[PDB]
Amino acid sequence: ASSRWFFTREQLENTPSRRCGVEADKELSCRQQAANLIQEMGQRLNVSQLTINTAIVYMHRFYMHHSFTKFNKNIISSTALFLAAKVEEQARKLEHVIKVAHACLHPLEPLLDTKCDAYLQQTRELVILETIMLQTLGFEITIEHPHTDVVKCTQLVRASKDLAQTSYFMATNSLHLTTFCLQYKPTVIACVCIHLACKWSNWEIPVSTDGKHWWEYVDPTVTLELLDELTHEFLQILEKTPNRLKKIRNWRANQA
């Protein structure tokens, strides 16, 4: 990414939402809730996990420049997915996105009347918000994700299917549950995810004939000290998201 899309600790603290009175933990919860919605919507729209990941990064970046108090995370989730789906060459109609968002957020409300003024107005709002989002993003629509680096590495180190799946899962979880995508390069986060997965499975990836550790093939700046630090931070974040933590434990239990 361009350097304006990585943020300092100070920048991640003093956000637009903070200046509107949103507590740091509440802002994190809003991001997590938005990612969760984007995931559910994407699934219903039958778009790729890539498309979903891209929309989640658009959401995270958008909220480095605007407050959750001003722009509803539900409408920005729709905007992000509508845009992402076009960018990732699996375009979805605005009506489809709107109806899927409605199915996710308002399952017990009646189905949307396409001909009514309220529906027409949310279509008009979404078109305007896409313009605002593109401007906010600097038209930098091309997003690199840790997943591609994860898969490349897990295949080369002859990971078991469980280790490969665990690494990919943790990459998706990193996007949903942390702001790592605003702080570190995708190659760093790929290593964090694989490291965590290895620790969880008590799996050791051998050093090479020149002594290089596996992560040195993925990112040339990464250290073990950084991997341990970021793994610990990731785990702390997971602990403070208790229902998602239960979900992850149920997932591994099922895998096991």
Amino acid of residue 130 = E
Report the length, in residues, of the chain: 256
Q: In the CATH hierarchy, which fold is given to the domain comprising 143-256?
A: Cyclin A; domain 1 (1.10.472)
Q: Which amino acid is at 182?
A: L
How would you class 194 by CB atoms within 10 Å of its CB: exposed for 0-12, middle for 13-18, buried for 19 or more? buried
Amino acid at 52: I
- Do the domains at 1-142 and 143-256 have one common CATH topology? yes
- Is residue 225 within 8 A of residue 143, CB to CB? The reply is no
- 148 CB neighbour count, 10 Å cutoff: 14
State both tokens at 236.
């702390």
Coil/strand/helix, residue 34: helix
Separation in Å, CA 43 to CA 50, 71, 76, 144, 213 = 11, 23, 17, 20, 37
AA identity, residue 248? I
Task: Give the Cα separation of 102 and 109 in Å (integer).
Answer: 8
- Cα separation, 121 vs 35, whole angstroms: 25
Burial of 178 per CB tally in 10 Å (0-12, 13-18, 19+): buried
| Triad 47, 186, 170: Cα angle to 5° | 65
DSSP annotation string for 157-224 = TT--HHHHHHHHHHHHHHHHH--GGGTS-HHHHHHHHHHHHHHHHT--PPP-TT---GGGGT-SS--H
Q: What gap in Å lies between CA 149 and CA 218, rounded to an integer?
A: 7
The alpha carbon of 113 is separated from its chain's Cα centroid by a whole number of angstroms, namely 32
Q: Which CATH number fits domain 1-142: 3.10.50.30, 3.60.21.10, 1.10.472.10, 3.30.70.1280?
A: 1.10.472.10
DSSP state of 4: G
Rounded CA gap, 5 and 248, in Å?
29
What is the DSSP-derived secondary structure letter of residue 6?
S
Nearest residue to 234 via CA among 210, 209, 199: 199
As given in the structure block, the two tokens for residue 230 are 């970021």
CA-to-CA distance for 131 and 226, rounded, in angstroms? 38
* CA 145, chain centre distance (Å): 9
Between CA 178 and CA 28 the distance in angstroms is: 8
Alpha helices in 63-185 (DSSP H): 73-87, 94-105, 117-136, 146-156, 161-177
**215 alpha carbon, distance to own chain's centre:** 22
CA dist 11 and 2 (Å) reads 16
> Taking a C-beta distance cutoff of 8 angstroms, is the pair 41, 66 a contact?
no
Would residue 151 be called left, alpha or beta, if left means φ above 0 and alpha means ψ between -120 and 50 degrees?
alpha
Alpha-carbon distance of 109 to 222, in angstroms, equals 49
> Distance between CA atoms of 118 and 137, rounded to whole angstroms?
28
Q: How many other β-carbons are positioned within 10 Å of the β-carbon of residue 85?
A: 23
Q: What gap in Å lies between CA 80 and CA 77, rounded to an integer?
A: 5
How many CB atoms neighbour CB 141 within 10 A? 15
Long-range Cβ contacts of 245-249 (<8 Å, 24+ apart): 248/173
Nearest to 167 by CA among 147, 197, 188, 199: 197
N- to C-terminal Cα separation, the chain: 37
Structural contact between residues 105 and 74, judged by C-beta atoms closer than 8 angstroms: yes
In the chain, the amino acid numbered 51 is T
- CA pair distance 58, 133, nearest whole angstrom: 8
Question: Could you tell me if 196 and 163 are in contact, meaning their C-beta atoms sit under 8 angstroms apart?
Answer: no
Where do the structural domains in the chain lie, given as residue ranges? 1-142, 143-256
